[PDB]
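Archive entry. Fields below.
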Amino acid sequence: AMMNQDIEKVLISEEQIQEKVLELGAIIAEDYKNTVPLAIGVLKGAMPFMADLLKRTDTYLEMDFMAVSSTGEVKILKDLDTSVEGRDILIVEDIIDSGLTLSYLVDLFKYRKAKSVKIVTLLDKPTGRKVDLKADYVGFTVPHEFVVGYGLDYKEQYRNLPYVGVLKPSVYS
Amino acid sequence: AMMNQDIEKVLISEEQIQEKVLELGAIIAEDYKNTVPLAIGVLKGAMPFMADLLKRTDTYLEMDFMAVSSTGEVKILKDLDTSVEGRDILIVEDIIDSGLTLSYLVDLFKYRKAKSVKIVTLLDKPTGRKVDLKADYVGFTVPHEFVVGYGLDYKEQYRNLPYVGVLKPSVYS
Ligand SMILES: O=P(O)(O)OC[C@H]1O[C@H](OP(=O)(O)OP(=O)(O)O)[C@H](O)[C@@H]1O
Ligand SMILES: O=P(O)(O)OC[C@H]1O[C@H](OP(=O)(O)OP(=O)(O)O)[C@H](O)[C@@H]1O
Ligand SMILES: Nc1nc2cc[nH]c2c(=O)[nH]1
Ligand SMILES: Nc1nc2cc[nH]c2c(=O)[nH]1
Ligand SMILES: [Mg+2]
Ligand SMILES: [Mg+2]
Ligand SMILES: [Mg+2]
Ligand SMILES: [Mg+2]
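PREDICTED_STRUCTURE:
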C-alpha cells in the first residue's frame, strides 16, 4: 500500500476515467464507422488509456505504436511497422503539455501521406504550450502541475497507478 | 455494433478477465514487493492485458516494450530502451501458443544478465507447444483454436474487443 502514500491529491479518479473512456469510445466509434483507422499509441505513457479507450470503441480498427524521446529536438526510438499512406490515423496520447511531441508526429504522418490525422489524449495541460497544438478529443484538462499515474511517470515509476494524481513534496526529496 | 456479429462464441468474458486481473495483480504485487521490476510488454498483443493487470498491481515498478516477429527464426523489430542488467524482469504477454516467442525473449534477457525473469500471460494454449515453455502466472487456459480479442488480432483487427472470442467461419472466407 505504498504508492498511494506518495500522492498528495487524486486529481482524476479511476471512476471518472472509466466514465470518460466509455463516452469517448462511443463517439470515436461513430467517427470512424466507415473506415478501418490505424490507432497509434505513443509509448510509453499512452498504453493504459489506449487499452481502456479502444476496449470501449466498438469499430474495426488496427493498432501500432511509436516511441519518441523529448531543446525541441524530437527523436524516434521506435517507428511504425505499418504504412500510413492513405490511412486514417488516430494518435493516442496520455498528455499534451508543450505540444512538441505531437507537433512532430502529426507532420511526420502528413509527410507520409496519411489520409487524415486526428489525436485523442487522456489529459491536456493547455498552460504548458510552447507550440500551437490541439487534440480532436480530450479526456480531461489539468492544471499547471506535474501529474503522475494512468501511464504518466516520475522517473519511470507510478505509470501503473489506476488514477491521476500529484506527488507529495518529499517524493521530490 | 458490428465486430460482435463476427464472433461465434465468447470464450472468456470481460467480467471474467476483470476478476482475474484483480486476483493476479495482488499476487504479483506481493511477489515484487521488495524490488522495482521492469515489466516488459510484448507488442502488439500484450497491451490491453498489461494495462489492466498493472493498474491492479499495487507496487513500484517500471515498464518497457518490445516488438518481435516470428521457420522458428524470431526477429526483434523494437528492442528495449532500458538495460536489464541486474533487474528483475516480468514479461507480459497475451498468449503463449508454440512457445517460440517467449523462449527467444527469456534467453535474450538471461544473456543480458537479468537478475530474474518471470512471465505473466493472459492466455495459455498448451496444446500448441513446440518447445518447452511455461509462464509463472497464467490468466486462463484456452483450447486448440484460433482466438481473438483483448489484444489478439486476426489480420491486425479485433484487438480492441473487450473479451476473448472465436471468429465465425465466414470471416476466414
Ligand atoms: O507535449 P509535450 O511537452 O511534448 O509532453 C508530452 C509528452 O511527454 C511524455 O512523454 P515522455 O517523453 O515523458 O515519454 P514517456 O511517455 O515514455 O514517459 C508524455 O507521455 C507525452 O508523450
Ligand atoms: O507462442 P507463439 O507461437 O510464439 O505465439 C505467441 C505470440 O504470437 C502473437 O503475437 P504475433 O506475432 O501475432 O504479433 P502481435 O502480438 O503483434 O499480434 C501473440 O501475441 C504472441 O506474442
Ligand atoms: N508524468 C508526467 N510527464 C509529463 C510530460 C510532460 N508533462 C508531464 C506531466 O505533467 N506528468
Ligand atoms: N489472434 C491470435 N494470435 C495467435 C498467435 C498464436 N496463437 C494465436 C491465437 O490463438 N490467436
Ligand atoms: Mg509520452
Ligand atoms: Mg514520461
Ligand atoms: Mg504478440
Ligand atoms: Mg498477432
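CURATOR_NOTE: The pocket of 9-deazaguanine (ligand 3) is lined by residues A 95, 97, 146-148, 152-154 (CB under 6 Å).
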